[PDB]
Amino acid sequence: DPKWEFPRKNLVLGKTLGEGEFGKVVKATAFHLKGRAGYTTVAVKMLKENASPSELRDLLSEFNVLKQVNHPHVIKLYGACSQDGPLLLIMEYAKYGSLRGFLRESRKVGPGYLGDERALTMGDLISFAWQISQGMQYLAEMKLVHRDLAARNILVAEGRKMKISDFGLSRDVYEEDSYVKRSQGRIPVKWMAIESLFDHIYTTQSDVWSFGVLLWEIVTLGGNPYPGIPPERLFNLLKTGHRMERPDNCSEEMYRLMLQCWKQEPDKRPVFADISKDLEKMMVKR
């Protein structure tokens, strides 16, 4: 695709920013990128060593989705090097790294959380969740299920702007408004809706469940969901109606929004437009 193809000689790769089930991401610079003169600092996504077909399919899927979507709170694709060498996706650089990393650093780095980019209040946290909701609201309009919504898969960029990232597992639902997988998925159990875990059904409403988990991660400043609970225990724990407890740093209204995202019946869960409205009300009143 000439719209996206970038000259490989104008890209220079540097240190690894992260490596895992999502693949490899390095910090880079691009010369004469999309008409910007001189060098622009970028992130480059590529396959890790000993890549499987699934990891190549995920890199290509990501390329295909980010070609079609544009939102202030979705990480930007700028280009690709897809000829005569490894597939490289050139992306928007997010200087603060993952949201999980950023929130966790805030327990340790002053001014920290207060109940300046390192100073955080409950207002900041509600704003982070609101930015992510708006991104997801747009993605749902675009008939996309992300499936991998989690604090580790959100990026924090210039001005502490939230950028939804990690589109490798995202799927089109234009027909039936569900994505169904015969085999077992690669989404961590503890972020999965009950119907995704038992029935392999992914919808915008299963993204709403995952958003509720992300909400619990945000207010706990990067806490580990269902802490101490082995993942195989979540089958029984969720079907008997157990949900994570209200954490210490959480209003009743915020906990009620989480509980609503974890309703057993997907249709009883709020939609992203309603989540964005609930987070707007919370902001304004405080």
Q: How far is the CB of 22 from ligand H6W (least distance, A)?
A: 4
Q: Would you count residue 121 as binding its own copies (CB under 8 A)?
A: no
Q: Work out what residue 188 binds among ligand H6W, Cl ion, its own copies, none; the CB cut-off runs from 5 to 8 Å by kind.
A: its own copies
List, comma-separated, the residues after which the chain is broken, a break being a C to N distance over 2.5 A; otherwise answer none: 115
> For residue 261, what are its two tokens?
């995202």
Q: Work out what residue 194 binds among its own copies, ligand H6W, Cl ion, none; the CB cut-off runs from 5 to 8 Å by kind.
A: none
Is residue 42 marked as binding?
Answer: no
What sections of the chain are H helices per DSSP? Answer: 53-68, 99-105, 122-141, 194-199, 204-219, 234-239, 252-261, 272-285
> For residue 90, what are its two tokens?
């050139």
- Residue type for 154, please? I
Q: Work out what residue 94 binds among its own copies, Cl ion, ligand H6W, none; the CB cut-off runs from 5 to 8 Å by kind.
A: ligand H6W
Q: How far is the CB of 154 from ligand H6W (least distance, A)?
A: 7
Of 207, 196, 208, 203, the closest CA to residue 178 belongs to 203
Residues 6+ apart with CB under 8 A from 69: 138, 139, 142, 144
Of 181, 202, 209, 195, the closest CA to residue 269 belongs to 209
Distance, first Cα to last Cα, the chain = 48
Of 189, 145, 151, 188, the closest CA to residue 168 belongs to 145
**Residue 260, phi-psi category: left (phi > 0), alpha (psi -120 to 50), beta (remainder):** alpha
Complex with its own copies: residue 73 or 146, whichever CB lies closer = 146
Is residue 22 marked as binding?
Answer: yes
Is residue 21 marked as binding?
Answer: yes
From 84, 116, 148, 207, the catalytic residue: 148
Complex with ligand H6W: residue 43 or 103, whichever CB lies closer = 43
Instruction: Examine the residue annotation and report whether 58 is marked as an active-site residue of this protein.
Output: no
Q: Would you count residue 237 as binding its own copies (CB under 8 A)?
A: no
Is residue 14 marked as binding?
Answer: no
Q: Work out what residue 238 binds among ligand H6W, Cl ion, its own copies, none; the CB cut-off runs from 5 to 8 Å by kind.
A: none
Q: Would you count residue 165 as binding Cl ion (CB under 5 A)?
A: yes
Interface positions with ligand H6W (CB under 6 A)? 17-18, 22, 25, 43, 45, 75, 91-94, 97-98, 152-153, 155, 165-166
Residue in 35, 110, 227, 230 binding its own copies, rule: CB under 8 A: 230
Phi then psi for residue 162, to 5 deg, are -75, 135
- The CA angle 142-148-150, to the nearest 5 degrees, is 115
Kindly identify the residues of this chain, within the stretch 145-174, that bind its own copies according to CB under 8 A: none
Complex with Cl ion: residue 59 or 261, whichever CB lies closer = 59
Q: How far is the CB of 101 from ligand H6W (least distance, A)?
A: 6
Q: How far is the CB of 256 from its own copies (least distance, A)?
A: 27
Number of residue whose CB is nearest ligand H6W: 18
Annotated binding-site ranges for semaxanib: 92-94
Query: Which positions are annotated as active-site residues?
Result: 148
Annotated binding-site ranges for ATP: 17-25, 45
